[PDB]
């Protein structure tokens, strides 16, 4: 089915670095240059107050829509990733259900400005106080802390490409039918990422990457807070949340 489902040579690993970086560039959603340029465009005190005055349900709906748009780009990234389309549909869905939000959380560090602790949201940069109407302050503060910690690594776009391919191709996800195929694809993607770090003298980031439990905790907290919101506003979730978001986080 795929060359990367077996042992790959050094030349094949070099090809894989290029393929993963290309897949990421083509599906990155927003250009890094565009996010950096917009750092000076910050919501005013008046604009922050307006977001704070929004209802809890209208703010949840807006955030669920923005997350779903980000997730759609991650699904396209997965489809372009060498080997992913050669996995069975059961496994593609297991990997995306478990990993799409983790990839969005990693990609989000590009949109996070560590200098003033702001994130790009709806056209300008705002701090965690922008999201106060959601009623999930611990989860927002945890996402901002995570972005802050990844921002301190000064990732290049190629490092995010290779790190997110690995976040997605995780042979430990429960439910995989072709586990040995995913294990080999994961091994080759790990070699591609580590080869790139070695070549660019960036192997020092390996001990600094967050543990898997960190991404798991963030995803667990998101599903828990969604369950709380859904109990409060069940018809908002049924009637106005995106179908893809419900498929990933509220069992359809």
């Amino acid at each position: 089915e795929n060359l990367y489902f077996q042992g790959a040579s050094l030349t094949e690993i070099e090809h894989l670095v290029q393929s993963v970086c290309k897949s990421y560039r083509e599906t990155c959603q927003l250009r890094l240059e565009d996010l950096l340029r917009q750092r000076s465009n910050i919501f005013s005190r008046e604009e922050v107050t307006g977001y704070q005055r929004k209802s809890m349900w209208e703010m949840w709906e807006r955030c669920a829509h923005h997350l779903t748009e980000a997730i759609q780009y991650v699904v396209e990234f997965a489809k372009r990733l060498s080997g992913f389309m050669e996995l069975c549909q059961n496994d593609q869905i297991v990997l995306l259900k478990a990993g799409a939000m983790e990839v969005v959380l990693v990609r989000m560090c590009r949109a996070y400005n560590a200098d003033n602790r702001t994130v790009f949201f709806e056209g300008k940069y705002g701090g965690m106080e922008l999201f106060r109407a959601l009623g999930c302050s611990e989860l927002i503060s945890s996402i901002f802390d995570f972005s802050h910690s990844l921002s301190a690594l000064h990732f290049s776009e190629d490092e995010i490409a290779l790190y997110t391919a690995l976040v997605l191709i995780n042979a430990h996800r429960p439910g995989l039918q072709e586990k040995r195929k995913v294990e080999q694809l994961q091994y080759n993607l790990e070699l591609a990422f580590h080869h790139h770090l070695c070549k660019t003298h960036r192997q020092s980031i390996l001990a600094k990457l967050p543990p898997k439990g960190k991404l798991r905790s963030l995803c667990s907290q998101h599903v828990e807070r969604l369950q709380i919101f859904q109990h409060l506003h069940p018809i908002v979730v049924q009637a106005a949340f995106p179908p893809l978001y419900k498929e990933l986080f509220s069992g359809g």
Partner: peptide, 12 residues
Amino acid sequence: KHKILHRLLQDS
């Protein structure tokens, strides 16, 4: 019972 992933995966 929303199933969108199957659609996105099969759409070429």
